[PDB]
């Protein structure tokens, strides 16, 4: 389907694909090269499939962070635009399309969260997070609230957590250090603590999600929300008198939202790389090219300096770009999935008082850096609650059964694995050894059917490691120091709390 002398472009269905086709039409009038724009479903998943066979589109448009993986698989051509062309785009957008120190796409558009406020309830929106409690108390007296936004998804709370020093993975040169996580430093702690205090003082409710915050703001019940350009249409329909502005500061520093950069990459299998360069550099990434796309469906803020200066006459787009430049580019590596799950658990757990802020972030720091489940024995694997939520990752290991060593974590797939629950907390009060025999019996019953057990707890560090150590001691009639050395050899971070270690030693006396 990919042929010399032709260009096929894939772009998602919610973008201005008709405006893009107009550009392709002008490219064909000037060059004789015909351009076909397509918007297939799940195109971000089809592309790595068709491209590994040497097929697919010539050009693919998608958010930059999906391209780091593509570039790892060698599916994206390296581009080398001249310095004069690079100077047409904001420098920070070129950092979003860097992989292993080589450019692998053209930045197109720029998107980030902003602060949205109701000019009737709040003519003077706050510049700092620290002002919001007093603002909330005055609005509550009139039956309103200061601020509602989606507290379930860490994407929405990260700008506050990052403000005083949190970061995902440390970025140095052109590579992220997946062993250097910044969710447990003092800035991250200071930001989460401020958020949790808003909840315990009743300025916000920990149950607020995307639709609850949207309905509240769009009906005039709360003075502010935190949201992105995809939400403006519904606010316009609601007819609220709103403005869009810079996110509040925290401890005098800007909130740092993650940035998504819509990008155009060139298929490494393409026989038309020079034509793709000509189309993208000489036609699309110009005032006329972006405008045609933008007239179809707005791009938001754009990476092209000259057209962004025109679009930012809309103060909402100016606010998006301003928040983006104070924020951080979304890391383009596959470890982001475990990061997001780790932080989402910490904020939920800290907001509900289930964990202290420090313990919640200490766990998130471990999980954000963790690998996959660790093999202890061929039928016995050790890992975290994150792993237990990934059905295909477990199936790839041949897992047939899970031991859930936690009080609150749910069993996600009761039709596809056998579950055993060990509902203990990770503290010096918990009597985990009263579950040893039941856990050991369950593992043996799975093993005798030729199954495999995945033992997990929140961090895969204390509770689940204790269960695996108990199994090894009883089954192999070995002492704790031997079983403990064996497991530390497969995952050095395991560490039962010292009360659990004491129960393990007392268990050995009885085996």
């Amino acid at each position: 389907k990919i042929e010399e002398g032709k260009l096929v472009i894939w772009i998602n269905g919610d973008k201005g694909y008709n405006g893009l086709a107009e550009v392709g039409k002008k490219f064909e009038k000037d060059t004789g090269i015909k351009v076909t724009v397509e918007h297939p479903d799940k195109l971000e998943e089809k592309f790595p499939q068709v491209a590994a066979t040497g097929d697919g589109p010539d050009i693919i448009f998608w958010a930059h962070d999906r391209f780091g993986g593509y570039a790892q698989s060698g599916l994206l051509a390296e581009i080398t635009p001249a310095a004069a062309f690079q100077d047409k785009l904001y420098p920070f957008t070129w950092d979003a399309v860097r992989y292993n120190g080589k450019l692998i796409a053209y930045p197109i558009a720029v998107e980030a969260l902003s602060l949205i406020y109701n000019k009737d309830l709040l003519p003077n929106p706050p510049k700092t997070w620290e002002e919001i409690p007093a603002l909330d108390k005055e609005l509550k007296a009139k039956g309103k609230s200061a601020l509602m936004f989606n507290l379930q998804e860490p994407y929405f709370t990260w700008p506050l957590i990052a403000a005083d020093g949190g970061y995902a993975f440390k970025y140095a040169a052109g590579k992220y250090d997946i062993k250097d996580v910044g969710v447990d430093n003092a800035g991250a702690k200071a930001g989460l603590t401020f958020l949790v205090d808003l909840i315990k003082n009743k300025h916000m409710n920990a149950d607020t999600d995307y639709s609850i915050a949207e309905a509240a703001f769009n009906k005039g019940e709360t003075a502010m929300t935190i949201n992105g350009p995809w939400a403006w249409s519904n606010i316009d329909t609601s007819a609220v008198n709103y403005g869009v502005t810079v996110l509040p500061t925290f401890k005098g520093q800007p909130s740092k939202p993650f940035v998504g950069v819509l990008s155009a990459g060139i298929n490494a299998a393409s026989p038309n790389k020079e034509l793709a360069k000509e189309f993208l550099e000489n036609y699309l990434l110009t005032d006329e090219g972006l405008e045609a796309v933008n007239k179809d469906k707005p791009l938001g803020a754009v990476a092209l300096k000259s057209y962004e200066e025109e679009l930012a006459k809309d103060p909402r787009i100016a606010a998006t770009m301003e928040n983006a430049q104070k924020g951080e580019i979304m890391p383009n590596i596959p470890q982001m999935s475990a990061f997001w799950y780790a932080v989402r658990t910490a904020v939920i757990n800290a907001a509900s008082g289930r964990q202290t802020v420090d313990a919640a972030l200490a766990a998130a720091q471990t999980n954000a850096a963790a690998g996959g489940p660790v093999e202890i024995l061929p039928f016995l694997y050790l890992g975290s609650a994150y792993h237990a939520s990934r059905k295909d990752m477990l199936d790839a290991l041949g897992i047939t059964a899970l031991i859930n060593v936690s009080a609150n974590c749910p069993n996600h797939f009761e039709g596809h694995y056998q579950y055993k629950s060990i509902p203990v907390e990770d503290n010096h009060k918990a009597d985990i050894s009263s579950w040893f025999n039941e856990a050991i019996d369950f593992i043996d019953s799975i093993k005798n059917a030729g199954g495999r057990v995945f033992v997990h707890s929140q961090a895969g560090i204390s509770r689940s490691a204790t269960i695996c150590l108990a199994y090894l001691m009883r089954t192999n009639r070995v002492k704790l120091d031997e079983a403990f050395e064996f497991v530390k050899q497969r995952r050095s971070i395991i560490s039962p709390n010292f009360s659990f270690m004491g129960q393990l030693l007392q268990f050995e006396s009885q085996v």
Partner: protein, 155 residues
């Protein structure tokens, strides 16, 4: 679930709903997943009659949520003087401490509520109590610019 409806009616100030929900069997000490009871929400939202009605029907005056807040904490933080007085009259611990070691006096000191501070002191509020940052109510009144309050607390 009558319990969740009772929590929302107490938060929202629906006096008649609160009474009718209880007459239909709603548990006056219904708690959500964080230990928040109707008395917590009525005290936070400043609904005096609902506070009185819940207490009359046997609500725990000293129920503490997952952060260690009692209704007295919330009423003092939110400046509701009459509810503060009603809770003390019904046996509220004037010196209840949350998980940050803060008492109602600390919280009224943050916002400079002079009358709530005087009521708490009269009921034996401990001006020596320090939170987990080593702060007394006096310290907090200093750090929040409540000079008139700091004059009174300077023992």
């Amino acid at each position: 679930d009558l319990g969740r409806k009772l929590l929302e009616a107490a938060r929202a100030g629906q006096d008649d709903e609160v009474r009718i929900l209880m007459a239909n069997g709603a548990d006056v000490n219904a708690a959500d997943n964080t230990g928040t009871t109707p008395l917590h929400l009525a005290a936070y939202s400043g609904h005096l009659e609902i506070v009185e009605v819940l207490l009359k029907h046997g609500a725990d005056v000293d129920a503490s949520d997952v952060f260690g807040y009692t209704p007295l904490h919330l009423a003092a933080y939110w400046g509701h003087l009459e509810i503060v007085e009603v809770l003390l009259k019904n046996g509220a611990d004037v010196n209840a401490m949350d998980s940050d070691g803060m008492t109602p006096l600390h919280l009224a000191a943050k916002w400079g509520y002079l009358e709530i501070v005087e009521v708490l002191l009269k009921h034996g509020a401990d001006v020596n109590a320090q939170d987990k940052f080593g702060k007394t109510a006096f310290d907090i009144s200093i750090d929040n610019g409540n000079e008139d309050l700091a004059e009174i607390l300077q023992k």
